[PDB]
Structures are given as C-alpha cells and as structure tokens.
Design a binder for this molecule. Sequence first.
Ligand SMILES: NC(=O)c1ccc[n+]([C@@H]2O[C@H](COP(=O)([O-])OP(=O)(O)OC[C@H]3O[C@@H](n4cnc5c(N)ncnc54)[C@H](O)[C@@H]3O)[C@@H](O)[C@H]2O)c1
Ligand SMILES: NC(=O)c1ccc[n+]([C@@H]2O[C@H](COP(=O)([O-])OP(=O)(O)OC[C@H]3O[C@@H](n4cnc5c(N)ncnc54)[C@H](O)[C@@H]3O)[C@@H](O)[C@H]2O)c1
Lengths: 338, 339
Amino acid sequence: IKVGINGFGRIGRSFFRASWGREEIEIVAINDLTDAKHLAHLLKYDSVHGIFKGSVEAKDDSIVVDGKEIKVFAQKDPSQIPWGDLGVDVVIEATGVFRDRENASKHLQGGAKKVIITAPAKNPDITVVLGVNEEKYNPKEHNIISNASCTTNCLAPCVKVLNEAFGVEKGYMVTVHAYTNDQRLLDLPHKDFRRARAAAINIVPTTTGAAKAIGEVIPELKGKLDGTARRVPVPDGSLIDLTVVVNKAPSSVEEVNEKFREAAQKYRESGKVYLKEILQYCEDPIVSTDIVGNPHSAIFDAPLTQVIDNLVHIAAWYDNEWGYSCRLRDLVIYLAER
Amino acid sequence: AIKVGINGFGRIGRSFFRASWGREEIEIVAINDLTDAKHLAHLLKYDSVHGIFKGSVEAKDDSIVVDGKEIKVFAQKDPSQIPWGDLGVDVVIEATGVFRDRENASKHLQGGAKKVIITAPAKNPDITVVLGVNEEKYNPKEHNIISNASCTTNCLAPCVKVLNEAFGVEKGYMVTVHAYTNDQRLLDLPHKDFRRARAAAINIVPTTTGAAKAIGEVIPELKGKLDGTARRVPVPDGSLIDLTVVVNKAPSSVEEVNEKFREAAQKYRESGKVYLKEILQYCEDPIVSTDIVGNPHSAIFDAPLTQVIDNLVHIAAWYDNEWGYSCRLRDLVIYLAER
Ligand SMILES: NC(=O)c1ccc[n+]([C@@H]2O[C@H](COP(=O)([O-])OP(=O)(O)OC[C@H]3O[C@@H](n4cnc5c(N)ncnc54)[C@H](O)[C@@H]3O)[C@@H](O)[C@H]2O)c1
Ligand SMILES: NC(=O)c1ccc[n+]([C@@H]2O[C@H](COP(=O)([O-])OP(=O)(O)OC[C@H]3O[C@@H](n4cnc5c(N)ncnc54)[C@H](O)[C@@H]3O)[C@@H](O)[C@H]2O)c1
C-alpha cells in the first residue's frame, strides 16, 4: 500500500521508522513545513531513538532512503498536496492541527483513499484501537479513521481485560506522561495555562480524553471512566495508573495478573500480525527508559497490581511515540487486508 | 524558646533550619553530620532549590555562626557520641534517614535530649503525628520519640480527613507523582530497591510508599481502606498526590467537593493555632510543580483537578516535599513547646 505522511514530526518520523523495511508498506510522499535537507537530517538523527540505520540522501524536492525516492512537499495547506498523482492510498495525518473532519477530509479531495488521524478526533468515521474494536471497521463506510491517542491504546486494552474478567462499574486513570511538543520549552503563551509552562522542569497537570472518550472503542464503558494526565520531565515513555471498582471482586492480586498473562497469550495466538504487539505481560522491575523502543500498546507491570476487595489498581507502560507509531504501521497493514 | 539539635544536616535538616530561622519560639544550638563546619555552612548558604540563605553564614573549626549566633557542629556517625545534654538541647531532629528504628533514635535521649522527632515514618515510635489530623493525641508525659510521618502522609492525611468527614471513605487508592530524593541514584547503581537503583533524573521510577497503607496510625478508622504507590519523576523538589476514593454519601457535584476543602482550609486558619495556619491551602489557579516550591503548606488543594463519578471522588493536592514537611517540623517543635 502507498502511504503519504503529512507532518513528519515525532509521530510521523517514528511511523516512518516503524514501517520501514516492511514489504506491506510503501511510503512515497512526505509533507511538512521545511525543505528536504532538514527532514532528511531529522530522520537520520533522533535524540530519543538513535541513528537511522538506513542510508539517507537529500535532494532538492525529495529524499532517497535506501535507494527509494520519496517526494517531499512543504504545503501548509493540505488541499495543495497531490496525493492523487502520487498514487497514495492512505495518508497519515500527523501535523496535529487537522484533527477536525473538514480539514482531514482535504486529503481525500486530493486523491487519498483513506486518512488516518494520529490522534483523537471530532467526527471521524470511526475511532479504532487495534486489539479492541478494529473489527468494527468497514472499508466502504470509513475513510477518515482516528487511531485515538497513545494513552487510549494503552488504556483500552487493559480496561478490556479487567472488564471481561470482573466487570468494570467505574474507574479513574492517571497517566504519568512524557512531555511532548504540544508543551513549551520555557513558559510561553499556549491555550492551556499549564501546557504553557516549562516542560522539562515541571510536573504538569493536563487533561486527556482517553478515559472520558473510552466509549468510542468500548461502548459499554461510556460515562464510566474519568482520567487525567501528569506530564513529567522525560523525553519519551509513559505509564498509566488505572483504578477501577469491579462487580466481581478478584480473589487476589495474582488472579488479576493471570488474566493479563492470558490476554497477552491470546493476542499472540490469534494469528493476526496486527495483534502481536498489543499487550506485553512483564514481571521485571523496570523504569521508563527500559520501555523506550518497546512496540507494545501496553506493557503490563504485574508487580504494581493492588487489590482491596472490589477496588482494583493496575499500571501499564507505553512508549508514547514508538508503540503508537507501530500501531499506525499495523493499522495501515490491517487496512490492506480490509 | 526550646533548644533544638539537628542530626543529619541534609535536605530536610537544612530546610528545617531555614524554616525555623528567625522564629523566636525556636533556638537551634547544635548540628551533627559527617563533614566539617565549612562544608555544612556552604551547603546551608547555597541551595540548588531554595536559593541563597538570607542570614550571614560564617564557618569556624567546631561551629558555624549564623547572624552572629554560634552553633556547635559535630561529625559523629554514632549518635551516642553527641553531647546534647551539655548543649542543653530539648528536642533533637533525627533526619539522617538511618536512625528510624526505636533503639537508635532513643540514643539521642540517652545523650541528654528530652525528645526526638524522626523525620520519617518509623516502627514502634511512641507516636506518629500529622499536624491538623491527630496532634491532640500527643501526650507530653508518655511520648518522647515522635514520628512526623512522611511528606506524602502530611499531604494525604489532611485531604482524606476532609473527604471522610464529609462523605465517608469506604476505600481508595493514591498515586503520588513525587520529585526524586537522595534515596535514589544519579546513574544506575546498586540499591536494595531494583527501581530506585536507576538514574533518577531521566526515569519515571515506580516505588512503594507506606503513606496510604499506614494511614491508620494517624486516622485509625481508615486502616486497611487505602492503598497507594509512588512515581518518582525528574523534578528536584515538588510533588503531587492524586487520590481516588469511593464514598458512602455521593456528592451532588464537584463544587460540593471543592467547597468542603475551601471550608476545611478556613477552619484551620480561624482556629487560632499557629501550628495549624499552613496545613491546607485552597487553590484555584492552574499551577505546576515549580509554583509550589517554597510553599509551606502540607497540602495545596488543586480545585480544578477535582472530578466525580457517582460515588467515586478524585482530588489532587500539591506539596513541596522538602519545604512543607520542614515547616511542619518547625510547627511540631513549637507545638511540643506549647505542652
Ligand atoms: N508525541 C506523542 O507521543 C504522540 C502520541 C500519540 C498521538 N500524537 C499526536 O500526533 C500529532 C503530531 O504529534 P507530534 O508529537 O509528532 O508533534 P510535532 O510537533 O512533532 O508535529 C509533527 C509535524 O507536523 C508538522 N506540521 C505542522 N503544521 C503543518 C502543516 N500545516 N502542514 C504540514 N506539516 C505541518 C510540524 O512541522 C512537525 O514536523 C498530534 O495530534 C499529537 O497529539 C502524539
Ligand atoms: N527529601 C524529602 O522530601 C523528605 C521528606 C520527608 C521526610 N524525609 C526523610 O528525612 C530523612 C532525611 O532526608 P533527606 O532527603 O534530607 O536526605 P539526605 O541524604 O539529603 O540527608 C541525610 C543527611 O544525613 C547525614 N548523615 C547520614 N548518616 C549520618 C550519621 N550516621 N550521622 C550523622 N549524619 C548522618 C548525611 O551527611 C546527610 O547530609 C529521611 O529518612 C527521609 O526519608 C525526606
């Protein structure tokens, strides 16, 4: 499948790296707000994920990665991108400013057959989280797809295991999340009064729609969960803390953990390539740097599980950039299959 | 004024010194650590988080002079070797972090001190106190080894007390996003705790806390009702608790929850008790960790972060783990004097 990337940023470039070398995907065009030389350099040297292994060459209006020539554009207006004449099937909308339906749909009016919004969206045709509700996707009816947020891809699978096993009545989630470019280096103007504050020297409370909008991927949990985020000084790597009240009080912490061990095993034996890196059952005492580069949507930290009668608490890690980008890679692959 | 001695002139020991300096109620006369007066004076003068010390600090061979007042300095790793008795010290602040056990902490008493305050949770202390929660349980005649609990307990206890008296806590969980401390490592190094062994300034480090589990020591009825955990993050100071509780009487709205906190804060202030003036602060401005660095309250309630779903209530409160706790130590010393 031909792929176009709009917004070659943290997610865009991680998506490029995640799907490179995979014969199922063929990235043919990239669009951002700079020249080819700057994009090539950003792709080669990453402060968080290391040096790109392939060979990167820059040209006037394109980059050649491992002999493959990829067209580079610098159109701030998405309607000006010729996805159609490039033979692009799917476009990865990762600029962060076109999460609305009318702007995201411009890519279609440009020759794209489908657009994937790398974030929660308002009025998309369908929001999908691999390993949770990807089957509710209908090729002919859905052209604007949201892959939700990094947080949702970690939260949904975990709450799914807890719900099917014990029945979640209500819950709350706090995510200790790495800072991102939607925050500021030093106190600067920003719509959100807190996201405006120096990111690398502050614990920054901010909102997240992961729990509140969980209803989009798991209908029966709608209005059952609330959540929030705490942005902290790590360049990448995040963790979710989920507390739920269940109908079936588990007999112990180990009964809860077993359910996760089994859910992870189930995904791996499904035979679906797009479900192989959804859930990882971990028992080693790790910290954020250990999961940087981990492709799973959720790395369940068994030792952190706690239970008080019908109150259940679990924690799961997720490389907010990498795991999510790998899900984007798997979502593109899934579309190929239909 | 009560004569005070400090054992362990570290983050807490020095912050305690700064917080109680100028206060006529307290008089610090001796300090013990593991280095010379010169190094201590310099550490006191220049702080990476709390700025330059206001008073004038001078170093001598066996002491430091702060604003013209001489303060004997010792370097005895074994607490039994400190002459608190000859110095006339009434209360000793045990802040080395390694003498939390009763038999070790009581060594200060055998040295002449009348009372000891362990700057952390402890096993078998005469009592564990949290100002604004159970200080009235203190008995001047039976309590000589006092635990001031942890920085987290001092934030958690006051907040759950509000929620319990207003709606009744059936059970809950607490997660605290906490600044890193000296019990962690700068770069991956051997440590009893596999995670606290990891580079603190570049990791989100999960670790245990007894704040919730041991809450019963300051609020007996909540014993076994709360559990919690900690997430150490790359911030040199400044922490935040996130508490979720299931209550008996579901609140009508978020505002009703916030109102209880606004009222609890007010009640502390018009209590007239000097030691309860900075227990709780009701805040409505959208702040971040650096905004509470230097804030003396045990808990800075962040009203805008409150959420409610049926009988599930969630609140968040900040606390300068070094400063707030230290001011509580200052207030505790004053409280002891008032008895
Ligand atoms: N950072 C994460 O971990 C993460 C995880 C999940 C989802 N997301 C979402 O992905 C999106 C992008 O995230 P990001 O972290 O990579 O941010 P980013 O700042 O790195 O932005 C991506 C790129 O978009 C380019 N861009 C901006 N406006 C453009 C325009 N009009 N035309 C073309 N290119 C344009 C920028 O120059 C940049 O290179 C956001 O909606 C974000 O919420 C981010
Ligand atoms: N950092 C916080 O926010 C915080 C909050 C609440 C309670 N506490 C508790 O206070 C205690 C000290 O904390 P800290 O953060 O200041 O740590 P710290 O390491 O910075 O302070 C310890 C000080 O004790 C001295 N010391 C060590 N062994 C000694 C000995 N045998 N004799 C004399 N001096 C000795 C050291 O030289 C050092 O200056 C700990 O028990 C800690 O858990 C810390």
